[model samples]
Target: MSKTAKLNNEEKLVKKALEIGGKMAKMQGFDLPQSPQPVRVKAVYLFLVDAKQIAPLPDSKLDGANIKHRLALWIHAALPDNDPLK
Candidate 1:
């Protein structure tokens, strides 16, 4: 069984990258829930979580994690070079 651990510096960096990505998504008119509209951001977070790109945590779930990574990747890719979010 895996154990949960507090986020380390690298994890925190990934989290911040996700946040920036989400903000860019919002600027492009992607509708996210007001509570946590940064779907793209959340997605990247999930990617880092499942890919073991960050330190392992006990609560990891592949299905949920993949969804977010895919979505974030899509949004991040779809963004145009000239887009203000860039």
Candidate 2:
């Protein structure tokens, strides 16, 4: 039997982003706070949940993207209601 838990949209977004970021950070031997602060986590969750609300930008420069490129860009995408000033 599967024991998967359910999540709402916002929480799901946060959870997915955190899960991938956490996994990748571990794989690359990155260190994080040994005991994560709840406030910090929640703050990030808010930012990311809003970030996921935006659609991906067109690959304008055609340079593709890595996580480092997309992470901050995604936050930008969520602001001014997708007005990228393009």
Candidate 3:
């Protein structure tokens, strides 16, 4: 059986990444599809890879779960030291 693990603050971080990253993607002329959450995560992941903010994951580790974790980590790193999520 599978369990649903809540990311808590990490979830908030992802949303922030979407807000900021989505804007950056738009500025770069990339269209982030208004589809499911995972698709949005993938779109932002590529944008971050191009911006040099985060490295691209290997093909073996490119699933939605890993991508979300990587993105959460990326946003966590980008936050200020005193951020509530820190």
**Number of the top lDDT candidate:** 3
TM-scores, all models, native as reference: 0.31, 0.32, 0.78
Model 2 TM-score, 2 decimals: 0.32
> Positional deviation of 4 in candidate 3, in angstroms?
26
What ranking emerges by TM-score with the best candidate at the front?
A: 3, 2, 1
lDDT tens digits, residues 1-86, model 2? 55233322333333344555445455656533435544333333334444463234345622322232343344333334533323
Ranking by lDDT: 3, 1, 2
> Mind giving the per-residue lDDT tens digits that candidate 1 earns over 1-86?
44223223333333444665456555755543445534544555555445444433344544445444444343333444312232
Cα TM-score of candidate 1: 0.31
lDDT for position 19 in model 3:
81
Give the 10-residue window scoring lowest on summed lDDT in candidate 2.
61-70
Per-candidate RMSD, Å: 11.5, 14.4, 6.9
Report lDDT (CA) for all predictions.
0.44, 0.40, 0.78
Predict model 2's lDDT versus the native. Answer: 0.40
The TM-score leader among the candidates is 3
What CA RMSD would candidate 2 show?
A: 14.4
For residues 1-86, write the lDDT of model 3, one tens digit per residue: 44223345677777778887898899888778898788998888889998998888999999988777777877766765524353
Off by over 4 Å in 3: 1-8, 82-86
Q: Candidate 3 local accuracy as lDDT? A: 0.78
